[PDB]
Amino acid sequence: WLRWVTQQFKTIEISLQEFKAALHSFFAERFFALFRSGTITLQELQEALTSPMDKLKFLFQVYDIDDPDELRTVLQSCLRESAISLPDEKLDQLTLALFESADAGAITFEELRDELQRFVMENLTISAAHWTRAYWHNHRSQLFCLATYAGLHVLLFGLAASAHRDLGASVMVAKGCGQCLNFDCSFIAVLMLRRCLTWLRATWLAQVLPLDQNIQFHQLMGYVVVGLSLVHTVAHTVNFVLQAQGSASPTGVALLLLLLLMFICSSSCIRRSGHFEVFYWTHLSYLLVWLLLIFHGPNFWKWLLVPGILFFLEKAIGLAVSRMAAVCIMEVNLLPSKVTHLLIKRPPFFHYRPGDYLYLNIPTIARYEWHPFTISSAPEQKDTIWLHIRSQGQWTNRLYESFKACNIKCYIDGPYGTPTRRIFASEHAVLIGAGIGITPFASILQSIMYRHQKRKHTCPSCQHSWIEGVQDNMKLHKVDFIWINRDQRSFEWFVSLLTKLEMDQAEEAQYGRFLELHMYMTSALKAIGLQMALDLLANKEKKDSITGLQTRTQPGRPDWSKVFQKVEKKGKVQVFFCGSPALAKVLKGHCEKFGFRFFQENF
């Protein structure tokens, strides 16, 4: 009640207030001025925080200044936090359309209220700001892996401790740290196999067990090896000093030097520099570490055997003939937001399902480094195979920098990935876009469009075109694309491709639509009447000015899930999603009531 109002007042410097009000900013300054002479009196805040008619009148007063200034105000709003990256040339047309829709003098409060009610008023907002047990429980409810490693470490430490309890306070620590080190130095290698991980990635084992964070888990076990080796060294030295009142010590010293080298020369700072050769050559010293530790520990080979032989087999299966091939880059083009687009020539013998990935390796950038990239070209394209890479690290950033200022060697190794025959062998399989790996969705869309157009048979004689039914390739009659991601900051390639496919199939939607686009932001701006300008623009040119697409990029977080529940039926409809377990689980639980054979969280 009144106490709540007092607390809100206590929660509350014009420039400081503007800065703290989530600034863009002429509109913000005008609103702050309209919010008297300028003071910290709580009456203005109470009035602002308190029917929709008053809010509409306040908004109308804020928009005006005493109505050509609205065009300048509209331009400022576009350049504001709305992130509307549009040219100023179209601003005149948008302002003219808005003035025509509003004035028909543009100072009429009643006209503004009617225009607002045409589309809202209840959502009277003028700001977006307010003015680790739960997270761990939520994340660990499906991970349950770090605790297992900790339990193994502790049980091994205790088991070695009970075996040397008689020795006094120094050698039992040594033995426990030692046994932990056999375990760690034996299995930190079996973590990383780039070959079998792909084979395991396409199974329910990968569905239940996370895989994509194996780099960070491997680095974490490297760190614990370093720490435990240091404490083991200190314990053995303090034991020797106590005894002070020839191969073991020198071999331990050599192992310590090797681990210190591998820790120093494999940190993030080294690979920040373009000395990938230095990192790889220093990091090839794992063989020397294993060889030294063989005849350093009495029973290290027992631990080393199984993972050692299995990793030796995994590395020995890779030859130039076995998987590798020589591919020459044909054309490379750089797109905005530091995304590089490659056009590698298709080898004569390469049949790949859509959505598969491959590992690229450019000798010029990194001589012996391999990174996975997802194919962004349809399998029906016989000329070139595309690859799309976003600069989210150093090596990709290195490629972008190098190509900033072509026939260079490239090596690709086969297609790998989950089979996509289930999507084509379905009826109205809707695809939901989430996460950062939305590259395979472009391949799937291109393949589906190509197969759809291949059945558009036209008779050359009488110029009659009749559509044949499904023929042994796909069984879909309609596909729905729904994209729910952080932004379109780096996916200009993907936006362009989806827009291209959309108006390529838009010429065929008069008799029946085949592809639907639902593009969401959930972070765009509602609270400011910027969409009023675009309302007329969308029908002015039959395409959104921000995208040049039939879809106008509607935001909305939960209403998208509700529409997914309310998604027309061309057959046994199926729902497929790809993202974090939270959103996928919510969508599945909502979808389970509707009786749909939906394999949600498929990725």
Ligand X SMILES: NC(=O)c1ccc[n+]([C@@H]2O[C@H](COP(=O)([O-])OP(=O)(O)OC[C@H]3O[C@@H](n4cnc5c(N)ncnc54)[C@H](OP(=O)(O)O)[C@@H]3O)[C@@H](O)[C@H]2O)c1
Ligand Y SMILES: Cc1cc2nc3c(=O)[nH]c(=O)nc-3n(C[C@H](O)[C@H](O)[C@H](O)COP(=O)(O)OP(=O)(O)OC[C@H]3O[C@@H](n4cnc5c(N)ncnc54)[C@H](O)[C@@H]3O)c2cc1C
Cα pseudo-dihedral 179, 182, 188, 194, rounded to 10: -150
**Amino acid at position 90, single letter:** K
Spatial distance between the Cα atoms of 217 and 191, rounded to a whole number of angstroms: 8
Structural contact between residues 530 and 82, judged by C-beta atoms closer than 8 angstroms = yes
- Choose the stretch contacting ligand X; rule: CB under 6 A; options: 127-135, 230-238, 318-326, 429-437: 429-437
Work out how close the CB of 271 gets to ligand Y at its nearest, in angstroms, rounded to a whole number: 6
Q: Is 580 in the site for ligand X (CB under 6 A)?
A: yes
29 appears as a binding residue in the annotation? no
Q: Is 347 in the site for ligand Y (CB under 6 A)?
A: no
Structural contact between residues 358 and 349, judged by C-beta atoms closer than 8 angstroms = no
314 appears as a binding residue in the annotation? no
- Choose the stretch contacting ligand Y; rule: CB under 6 A; options: 19-27, 35-43, 385-393, 499-507: 385-393
Per CB under 6 A, the list member of 220, 226, 231, 525 interacting with ligand CCCCCCCCCC is 220
Work out how close the CB of 451 gets to a second copy at its nearest, in angstroms, rounded to a whole number: 9
Q: Is 208 in the site for ligand X (CB under 6 A)?
A: no
Spatial distance between the Cα atoms of 280 and 282, rounded to a whole number of angstroms: 6
Q: Is 374 in the site for ligand Y (CB under 6 A)?
A: yes
Candidates 103, 35, 92, 104; CA nearest to 67 is: 103
Residue nearest to ligand HEB as judged by C-beta position: 297
Count the Cβ atoms, other than its own, within 10 Å of residue 162.
11
DSSP string for 148-209: HHHHHHHHHHHHHHHHTSSS-SSHHHHHHHHHHHHHHHHHHHHH--TTHHHHHHTSHHHHHS
Cα pseudo-dihedral 347, 350, 355, 360, rounded to 10: -40
53 contact, one of a second copy, ligand X, ligand HEB, none, CB 5-8 Å limit per kind? none
Work out how close the CB of 223 gets to ligand CCCCCCCCCCCC at its nearest, in angstroms, rounded to a whole number: 12
User: Rule CB under 8 A: which of 343-382 touch a second copy?
Assistant: 351, 380
Residue nearest to ligand X as judged by C-beta position: 580
User: Rule CB under 6 A: which of 475-494 touch ligand CCCCCCCCCC?
Assistant: none
Structural contact between residues 94 and 533, judged by C-beta atoms closer than 8 angstroms = yes
Q: Between 166 and 205, how does the x/- string for binding to ligand CCCCCCCCCC read (CB under 6 A)?
A: --------------x-------------------------
Q: Is 132 in the site for ligand CCCCCCCCCCCC (CB under 6 A)?
A: no
Task: Please tell me the count of residues contacting a second copy according to CB under 8 A.
Answer: 13
Structural contact between residues 475 and 424, judged by C-beta atoms closer than 8 angstroms = yes
Candidates 390, 355, 395, 398; CA nearest to 491 is: 390
Q: Which is nearer to ligand Y, 394 or 402 (CB)?
A: 394
Candidates 544, 490, 539, 486; CA nearest to 517 is: 544
Candidates 52, 73, 75, 71; CA nearest to 125 is: 52
Work out how close the CB of 62 gets to ligand HEB at its nearest, in angstroms, rounded to a whole number: 54
Orientation of helix 171-191 relative to helix 214-243, angle to 10°? 160
Q: Is 239 in the site for ligand CCCCCCCCCCCC (CB under 6 A)?
A: no
Spatial distance between the Cα atoms of 228 and 231, rounded to a whole number of angstroms: 5
Spatial distance between the Cα atoms of 412 and 326, rounded to a whole number of angstroms: 7
Give the chain's count of helices (H) and strands (E).
Answer: 26, 12
Spatial distance between the Cα atoms of 602 and 598, rounded to a whole number of angstroms: 9
Helix (H) or strand (E) holding 276: helix 276-282
Q: Which is nearer to ligand HEB, 182 or 551 (CB)?
A: 182
- Choose the stretch contacting a second copy; rule: CB under 8 A; options: 67-75, 265-273, 362-370, 462-470: 462-470
- Choose the stretch contacting ligand CCCCCCCCCCCC; rule: CB under 6 A; options: 208-216, 242-250, 323-331, 500-508: 208-216
394 contact, one of ligand HEB, ligand Y, a second copy, none, CB 5-8 Å limit per kind? ligand Y
Candidates 421, 418, 416; CA nearest to 473 is: 421
Per CB under 6 A, the list member of 74, 484, 532, 534 interacting with ligand X is 484
User: Rule CB under 6 A: which of 399-438 touch ligand Y?
Assistant: 437
Work out how close the CB of 160 gets to ligand CCCCCCCCCC at its nearest, in angstroms, rounded to a whole number: 12
Q: Is 133 in the site for a second copy (CB under 8 A)?
A: no
Per CB under 6 A, the list member of 127, 249, 392, 580 interacting with ligand Y is 392
User: Rule CB under 6 A: which of 152-211 touch ligand HEB?
Assistant: 175, 178, 181-182, 185, 188-189, 192-194
Q: Is 357 in the site for ligand X (CB under 6 A)?
A: no
- Distant-in-sequence contacts of 323-328, Cβ < 8 A, 24+ apart: 323/413, 323/414, 324/411, 324/413, 325/411, 325/412, 325/413, 326/409, 326/411, 327/410, 327/411, 327/412, 328/407, 328/408, 328/409, 328/410
Burial class (CB within 10 angstroms; exposed 0-12, middle 13-18, buried 19+) of 105: exposed
Work out how close the CB of 383 gets to ligand HEB at its nearest, in angstroms, rounded to a whole number: 32
Distance set, CA 487 to CA 131, 375, 431, 561, 577 (Å): 25, 22, 18, 18, 18
Q: Is 464 in the site for a second copy (CB under 8 A)?
A: yes
Give contact residues for ligand HEB (rule: CB under 6 A): 175, 178, 181-182, 185, 188-189, 192-194, 218-219, 222-223, 225-226, 229, 232-233, 236, 248-249, 252-253, 255-256, 259, 262-263, 266, 286, 289, 293, 296-300, 369
Give contact residues for ligand CCCCCCCCCCCC (rule: CB under 6 A): 145-146, 191, 210, 213-214, 216-217
Give contact residues for ligand Y (rule: CB under 6 A): 212, 215, 357, 371-374, 388-390, 392-396, 437, 439
Give contact residues for ligand X (rule: CB under 6 A): 212, 434-435, 437, 484-486, 520, 522-523, 557-558, 560-561, 579-580, 583, 603
